[PDB]
């Protein structure tokens, strides 16, 4: 019945990126009439995703306002969730030899899952499951530059290409930054928090971007 | 708070809730990739889905407020869904073969006996033993029927797409349907396993009601696609 | 808890709650394939199942919470619901016809009496019998009107289609209409049974108002794709 | 429990909830069987209907709560309405007259007196005759500008839509002084079942019935302009 | 109980909520009165009526509960909701020049620095003058570089909608300030703080948002005749 606190810093993140999800979903959604059937699945999915998210988020932020414990079940149920979608996402753009890709991709994205949770559930030590986790992220990376082999759609996948790098960096730099020093669970919950906004909306809004260009640049043709 | 992994089934049943919450948007919103002849199937599946969803809310409620299998819950989701997939069964024949609306009606008796008979099982309205045999004869009624009884008229291979949707049905009502018996076994004959009913009636409804839905968008968006040339 | 299988009442509600739900959503999505001539007949079947679904809702939540029959909400219900159902003659029969609102208002006022008749009679106002005499006087001159009356004139000067639904449509009232009744007379004409009584409304509810919406969906979906061939 | 049959009011308030609910699906919904020219006003007419539903939802929560008037949700949900009602007046003016805009403002500003004069006289803040009165000038000071005033056409659903307007802000809203004059005016306690009552007729006759003009006349004119 | 009208700010929050309700429902719905070229900038209009919605639900529970000021809900939602109304400016902009990606992260700063010097105020954080002064800056330093700094016209609805843009962060958002003024700087005055705040959300969210519906549907309208 009060208003926010202030002082939770995790609480305040948490409400953001609820929105923000909220608002993407939305967002994403609506604007599927502003890209052509080439693009319009693509969409679909960015939504999905970003409501999965959502309602996750509702539930995280319950989690820590009745009790101030990390939700690591729920955070990973959302990422069992959310990831396999995203990379969906990746076999969507290429459909060459990209059945094998995607089976290969979701694979080594669950062992980085699998890797990472069995670290914060305490069913595994910290580090070593921490390497297993970068093991299938970076297999992941490998099979995209070092595996295969219209200018949209390359501007598409090249953008994939650095989220997968670059964007995911940030979650474990969370795990990192919670477990891999002196639990610092609010400097992991910020981390996650801020890397699934990046991650599930700047993804998403990339994808939008070249569809609408594309699905422009084909309406005058 | 937390989810408690240490509830498997608890996690099983909160994994589906979502699968079939964006499973019913998935289909509801990409009506819109597909031709005036496809469409209804996808309000079907969508249907089919949306139903699962707000009874998977409540299956997961009684699981995890009292730990009981929520047996009621589940049969009557079937009781409404199952129909409409035979619907679905009966879109696609009568796209390859003018026979039917007779098979309608049997594979709907033959779905209302195979339901009936397993809820009896685990209601304790009937021994399981019983009643599973006489489910498995309303589910096996329905395979026969379908490709050696009446269905024996024949098929028709003029459209690749029919054909492979067609081909759908069957993989799913013989090999995809196969996993709910499964599951009655493991969890009423061995010597009632809950854990194990639940979590394979569970993934069942996956495979049955999302991955189902999948395959015919899939036809559905190809079809279509194919079709904006010509 | 698990919903009680031994209440069947209470199972049936839920049942029906679901199937309006489901409907509701059905005839919305489904105008998308259906040309403008029939698109309000498909708007106005899903309002129908919606306001069936919300009051469903409250009935299911009365009998679980007390035992009682919801005997205003049902009456309610089919208060809301009936016109509409008989706004669809008006609707698929403007064009070729002036007395469209003749007929319509005839109807309506058949429709009035008929379940303000049984009204009187469940809640205690008149006696059952006399009721449910009146009651089928309402319903009876409907059916006289949609068979050989101003329905039947209206009807004459029309497509082929809408004679395919018109027809349809009055033989739900006819033959579909009858589990009402019938339902009535389970409950108040024997040696009250609410469980045979909400049993019965409960099936009648779930028929007739699905295959009434699924009827004008049929007509007005084979319609317009033959008219988008004819057309191209 | 059941609903309470004996609760006329009551019975009343969960009617109008209904139908303000199945029209603003209607109006919304029916947006694609209307040409460009009309879609906007169809959105106005859902928004005026939509915004109603809630309202009427906790109406309803105070009288079966309290058994008293819920004088603030009714006036509130005029105050949100009416402007929108007048919005759709203005926009019926643009295709008519040349002077829509000053109009508008003229409109919305009798609107704003009688709900206040209204307003004063059922809350308690001023005698509810002069508040009447006062009411009363501010409808007839839009009724006068309509006829006499600056609103004194070459289509036939604009014909039809502005003969439309002119006859619903007379006999339409005429039934709300009506309910008031019932309620404050003749045995003055308050008939608060006889008000509540008359408003929820008015509120039906005209944000549902009217709509139900609005979309016939344009769900015409756009399937008529559709050939050629 | 029936609504309490004693409580004046208790109903400019219920007003204001359902403005934002309705106002949501029209930018979406009515997309399909403008062409591809304003359904992205409809979308986001509703985005931040759809935002607010939610927001003013929470601050008007939080006016009734407790009668506290909710700073926290409201600079919670300019913080979803700036940053969307600045994204719509760099919409508009790339319409009118060659730079408007430089402007959006000048505009976006300048706005960040405008809320947080405001919060740190209002939440009692810093002195609630040079927190006025510091948040004046941000404001002012967007208009600097909109008016007479990087932002120095193409058809005539790019040039209608550039012009409410730039009318609406000067006379538009000034509403907002002159609330903080009405409430922290007279000798805290939390009612015409809270109601100034409310009718300057009405005014930027929903009236600015029908002015860009305005320029679009005609717009939309007249190109149609080809
Ligand atoms: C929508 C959520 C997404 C795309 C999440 C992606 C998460 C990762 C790529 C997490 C990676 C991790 C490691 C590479 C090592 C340790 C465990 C992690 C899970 C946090
Ligand atoms: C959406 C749900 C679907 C398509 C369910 C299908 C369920 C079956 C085919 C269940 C079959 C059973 C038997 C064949 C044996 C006895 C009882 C069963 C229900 C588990
Ligand atoms: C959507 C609901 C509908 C169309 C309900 C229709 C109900 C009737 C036609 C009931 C008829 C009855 C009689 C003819 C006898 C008196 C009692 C009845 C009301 C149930
Ligand atoms: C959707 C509601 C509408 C368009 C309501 C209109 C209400 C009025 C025009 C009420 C008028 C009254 C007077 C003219 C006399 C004083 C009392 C009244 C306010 C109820
Ligand atoms: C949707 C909300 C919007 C566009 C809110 C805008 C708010 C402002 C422009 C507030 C400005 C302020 C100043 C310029 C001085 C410092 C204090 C303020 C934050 C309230």
Request: a neutral charge; glycine letters at 16%.
């Given at each position: 019945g009060g208003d926010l606190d202030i002082s939770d810093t995790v609480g305040v993140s948490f409400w953001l990126v609820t929105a923000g999800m909220l608002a993407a979903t939305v967002f994403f959604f609506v604007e599927r009439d502003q890209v052509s059937a080439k693009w319009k699945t693509s969409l679909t999915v960015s939504g999905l995703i970003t409501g999965i998210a959502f309602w996750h988020y509702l539930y995280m932020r319950g989690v820590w306002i009745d009790t101030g414990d990390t939700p690591t079940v729920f955070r990973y149920i959302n990422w069992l969730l959310t990831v396999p979608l995203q990379v969906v996402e990746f076999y969507l753009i290429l459909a060459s030899v990209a059945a094998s890709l995607f089976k290969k991709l979701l694979a080594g994205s669950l062992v980085m899952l699998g890797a990472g949770f069995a670290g914060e559930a305490g069913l595994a030590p910290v580090l070593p499951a921490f390497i297993i986790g970068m093991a299938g992220w970076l297999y992941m990376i490998y099979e995209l530059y070092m595996g295969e082999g219209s200018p949209a759609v390359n501007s598409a996948y090249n953008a994939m290409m650095m989220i997968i790098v670059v964007g995911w960096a940030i979650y474990p730099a969370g795990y990192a930054a919670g477990?891999?020093?002196?639990?610092?669970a609010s400097n992991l919950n910020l981390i996650y928090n801020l890397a699934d906004f990046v991650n599930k909306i700047l993804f998403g809004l990339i994808i939008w971007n070249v569809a609408v260009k594309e699905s422009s640049n084909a309406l005058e043709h």
């Open positions: 477990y891999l020093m002196g639990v610092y």
